[PDB]
Amino acid sequence: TSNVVLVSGEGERFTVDKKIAERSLLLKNYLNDIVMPVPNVRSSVLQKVIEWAEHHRDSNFPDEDDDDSRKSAPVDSWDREFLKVDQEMLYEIILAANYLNIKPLLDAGCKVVAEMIRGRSPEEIRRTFDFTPEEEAAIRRE
Amino acid sequence: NRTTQLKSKHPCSVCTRRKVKCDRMIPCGNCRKRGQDSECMKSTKLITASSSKEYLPDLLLFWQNYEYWITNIGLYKTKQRDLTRTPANLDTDTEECMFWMNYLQKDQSFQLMNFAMENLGALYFGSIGDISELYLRVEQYWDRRADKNHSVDGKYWDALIWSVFTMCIYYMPVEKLAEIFSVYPLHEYLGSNKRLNWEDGMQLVMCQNFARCSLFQLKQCDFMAHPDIRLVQAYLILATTTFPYDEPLLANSLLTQCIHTFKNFHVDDFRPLLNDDPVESIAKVTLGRIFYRLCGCDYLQSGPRKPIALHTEVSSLLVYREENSTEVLYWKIISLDRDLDQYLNKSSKPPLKTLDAIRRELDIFQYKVDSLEEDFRSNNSRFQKFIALFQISTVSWKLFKMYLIYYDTADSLLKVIHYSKVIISLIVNNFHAKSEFFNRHPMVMQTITRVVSFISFYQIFVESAAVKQLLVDLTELTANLPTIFGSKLDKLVYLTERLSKLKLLWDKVQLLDSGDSFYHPVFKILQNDIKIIELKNDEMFSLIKGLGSLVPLNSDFRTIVEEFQSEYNISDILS
Amino acid sequence: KEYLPDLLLFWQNYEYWITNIGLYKTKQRDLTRTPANLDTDTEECMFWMNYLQKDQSFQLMNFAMENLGALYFGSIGDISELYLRVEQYWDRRADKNHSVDGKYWDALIWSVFTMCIYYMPVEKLAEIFSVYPLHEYLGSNKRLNWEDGMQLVMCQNFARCSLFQLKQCDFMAHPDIRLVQAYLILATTTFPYDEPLLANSLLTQCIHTFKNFHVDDFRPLLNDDPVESIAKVTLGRIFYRLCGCDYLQSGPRKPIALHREENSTEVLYWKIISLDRDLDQYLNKSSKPPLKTLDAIRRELDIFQYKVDSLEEDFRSNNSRFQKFIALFQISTVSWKLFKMYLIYYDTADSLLKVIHYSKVIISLIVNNFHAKSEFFNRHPMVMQTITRVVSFISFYQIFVESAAVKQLLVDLTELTANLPTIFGSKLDKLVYLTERLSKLKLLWDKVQLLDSGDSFYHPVFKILQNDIKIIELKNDEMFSLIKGLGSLSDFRTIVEEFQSEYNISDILS
Ligand SMILES: [Zn+2]
Ligand SMILES: [Zn+2]
């Protein structure tokens, strides 16, 4: 198996196996016509993506289009430990994957963020107010 | 071109206190006109980042209309006429086709058929099927020369084989063509320059003369007096060359004749029912193939010079009753193309669920086109692979262009650059030996015209180095497309060249302001070109000229506009 | 006697297939034996244009201007202006190079010349032309005079010359409105019955060239150049006339549908033909139009009856009498079809009396034209269609219900049929044959006892009438042409086969 070449946004040349790089559908459509560039992606982010793809190279995720019907199904512990980073790195993971068209990582990351959303304290949600300043006081009345 | 940015939820309290409409684009297009800026802004959210490009979204929405009335209609599908100077067809092309049927000889035609059987199969197989049986018909033509009485059916077979001869002459590489034919009596007859070789332009001349002699035989058939399937077959053979772009209203008239000839049969369903002749079932399957190829070559001649839509009940939103053999999946691509490009001359926005379904069908078709194996020596299967992958590339490009314009999703522009590089790669990979003529299909002219026009238009306003290198790539590619696009290719050059000059007019003159909308000569020239071509396609003047003796008789900003229109006129894209 | 209503419902279907489709709109062909015209009528149209002279053409135009107004006003209005074009014709005769627009004008005036040759009565027609070079060229019998058939021959050759000039124009490459003008000149004669599918092809060219202009509304505006208003009113004329000539050619060989002083008469004609469409949209469908629809059609028919009775005429203005004739004949024909559908679907009291009444009205309208200076009034194809419908339903109702008034009426129809003018030619003969066939179809209903199954009935006349429909529906499929185009691919029965062996149906087809 000849290996393929990805280029990050920072100019780094990554080299990886074909059968794990074909997890990203952009690379699949690109090589079914080897260097492919991936801009807007920090090099650590692309390395995290290639690590996550090499971990699940023989996994099985449901399905193709029964997705939001079969989801929700809870996420495995290795991926949640993998995505236990600060939030700017997380949004960079999600945007880079949405460029790379990897849907199961996208669903896993969105489940993490939605877990952060669905679950906030009541004291958080009492902030940031509506383009009516005067009517806000009538809302702030009670 | 209305200014905009940062859509600002509520209507502002200034515009509500005075009871006018509130353009919410921050702060207003109205408060900025008066000079009341501190009132509308300084309530909440004092976050400013003056990007100085607030003229961009309505400009990008204007690109929709400019693509629709320049790149589509006004370059390919437009032809002005002069009824008082076009000469009458007094010879009726009798001398012309007399000579250009005394030219072609027998073994030459057999070598043409050999090349056709070898290398062109994915064109005519959807129409007629086997070609070698058709050799017999060729035999019959060469059996029936010196006779003085001919059947209607025989001249129909002759018209079909001359259309296939025209497809051969169009798609042949110049070395084999120089092996087979000779040159010298063509310059003895026509009267062009006596050193014009086959790369010089005689290929296009001989191709158009063969298509004209095919139509001459169809005229000897009295083809409007006998509806038969061979008119439809000869048209679908001729509808892969540039004959849909030489005489476009003649093509529209012949296509209407073919629509009538198909609808004569009153066939609605194509699946063979349980209680029929096997001959009837074979006939209805062949009819299904010809109907889908007809719907394709009917959609690719839309516009205002052809009103009769065939297009009966065909969609792919949330056709299915068919076998995905080759022609149904060739149709589904163009159905998705129609479902995207119905929004050019509209004024509404397609929702999210539509484009998401289009993205999912795009993935399915990518999967089940790349999921086919073949033989490497099978040249025809490679060429079918080229056509299917080029079409799916073009549809992906238009999809993310519409994403970019209507909603500007995450990193849309670089995706457009990505698929543009893919299209460039698919032509440059075919620049090598033995696969040269693969760049002679009309869909590459369509896709290259769309790409170079959007990249020049986006070059004029917003600059990045990747976009500039991409434009250099496109210019390098357009410099070496094959010469059989001929004069059409030259006019595409002119259009891009005009846009290059329109960059300089963005530079040497400052953008003005009026508080609400902007003003610049480039906007007026841009919206002067669409007005000139929409004048050129209102047929009321020919109507008044035809009904009888009713003869119709009707700052330095303006100086700059009229100087640029005096030097670089739009009306040189016509002929 | 319960067999009557289902037999009446069978009459609708038999009328739709045999009378309309079969006798007029069906032409079989042999693509293997039909000679492809390598000459392309060059010798033929060359001779029929070297024959015609100049002052003869002016006399043709004089008869056209005086006595033909209510046909060409719907398309081209004034014709004296067109005199100038005629001059240009003889001014551009012996030239060596030509144009496109001049050839379109020549095609229009040749179509008008075809109409002039067609509606000319035999006296002046003999006064103009000779007969001798016609038999020097064609070589038929010298005694063949103009009433013998040379009128129809010269009419069809001038129609052929007009289509020859339209094919010199390359008319599929220069779509102008004069194609529509030449076609709506030619579509008033019986040229849509010589070559029906060629006429369908030309009509589809006309629909294409019309929708090439993109004009929906024809109402003029204050803020327009009045040249545009003149053009939009002219286009409104040509649109409604072309929709009428659409409805005259429905069926299975044309599947591309379209839907002050004298303009009110044009609106009158269109509303007549639209009510005709509203009636005859029930032939081949199995639907029964209800009573409310028939009552509304009757009330509107009374209103248009009053409006046509509110018209006027003048005995020297022969065009006014011809216009009155056409309008009254149309209103009578639609009235007859209304009460025929009354009789068949519902059988109201004195439905039959109204059928007999309007039948006598139609007979009087045709017979009263037999005076001098009123012959050519009969040469319009709507009376041919109407006579066919009337005499077929009279014979069909004669066979199964017998009455002395109806029998005298059928004798009147049969007496009237043999005195229609010669210009329908062989087509006329075929209608006679149909009537004669129905006469023999009476006799078989006489000498045979009707059987009974307890539920349904049996008689050979039923099987003969059903076999004719199935034979012509077999002749109305192009599947055999498709296969030839793709590649190289009790004594009941005895009586039925004896009658079908003697009186075949294939004589009514071309
Ligand atoms: Zn406001
Ligand atoms: Zn404001």
Residue numbers in the entry:
A (entry chain D): 3 to 35, 75 to 170, 175 to 187
B (entry chain B): 3 to 320, 334 to 569, 588 to 608
C (entry chain A): 55 to 313, 336 to 565, 588 to 608
Quoted passage from the original study:
The centromere is distinguished by the presence of nucleosomes containing the histone H3 variant, CENP‐A. In budding yeast, centromere establishment begins with the recognition of a specific DNA sequence by the CBF3 complex. The ~445‐kDa CBF3 complex consists of four proteins: Ndc10, Cep3, Ctf13 and Skp1 present in a 2:2:1:1 stoichiometry (Lechner & Carbon, 1991; Doheny et al, 1993; Lechner, 1994; Strunnikov et al, 1995; Stemmann & Lechner, 1996; Russell et al, 1999; Espelin et al, 1997). Previous studies have suggested that Ndc10 and Cep3 constitute the DNA‐binding activities of the complex. Both Ndc10 and Cep3 are capable of directly binding DNA (Espelin et al, 1997; Purvis & Singleton, 2008; Cho & Harrison, 2011; Perriches & Singleton, 2012); in the case of Cep3, sequence specificity for the CDEIII element is provided by zinc‐containing Gal4‐type DNA‐binding domains (Strunnikov et al, 1995; Espelin et al, 1997).
Here, we present the structure of the 220‐kDa Cep3‐Ctf13‐Skp1 (henceforth “core”) complex determined by cryo‐electron microscopy at an overall resolution of 3.6 Å. The density clearly shows that the N‐terminal F‐box forms part of a small helical domain, which is followed by seven leucine‐rich repeats (LRRs), placing Ctf13 in the sub‐class of FBXLs (F‐box proteins containing LRRs; Kipreos & Pagano, 2000). Interestingly, the Ctf13 F‐box/Skp1 interaction present in our structure is significantly different from all currently known examples, with substantially altered positioning of the helices in both the F‐box and Skp1. Our structure also highlights the function of a previously unresolved loop between residues 105 and 112 in Skp1 in forming inter‐subunit contacts. The structure provides an answer to this question. As previously described, one of the Cep3 Gal4 domains is stabilised by interactions with both Ctf13 and the F‐box binding segment of Skp1, with clear density visible at the tip of one Cep3 monomer, close to the N‐terminal of the crystal structures. The quality of the density is sufficient to visualise the Zn2Cys6 cluster, assign the correct amino acid sequence and the build the likely path of the loop connecting the domain to the rest of the Cep3 protein. By superimposing the crystal structure of the homologous Hap1 domain (King et al, 1999) bound to DNA on the Cep3 Gal4 domain, we can trace the likely path of the DNA. This modelling clearly shows a severe clash between the DNA and the LRRs of Ctf13, indicating that this domain is likely incapable of DNA binding once the complex has formed. It should be noted that we obtained the core structure without pre‐treatment with λ‐phosphatase; therefore, the presented structure likely represents an inactive state of the core complex.
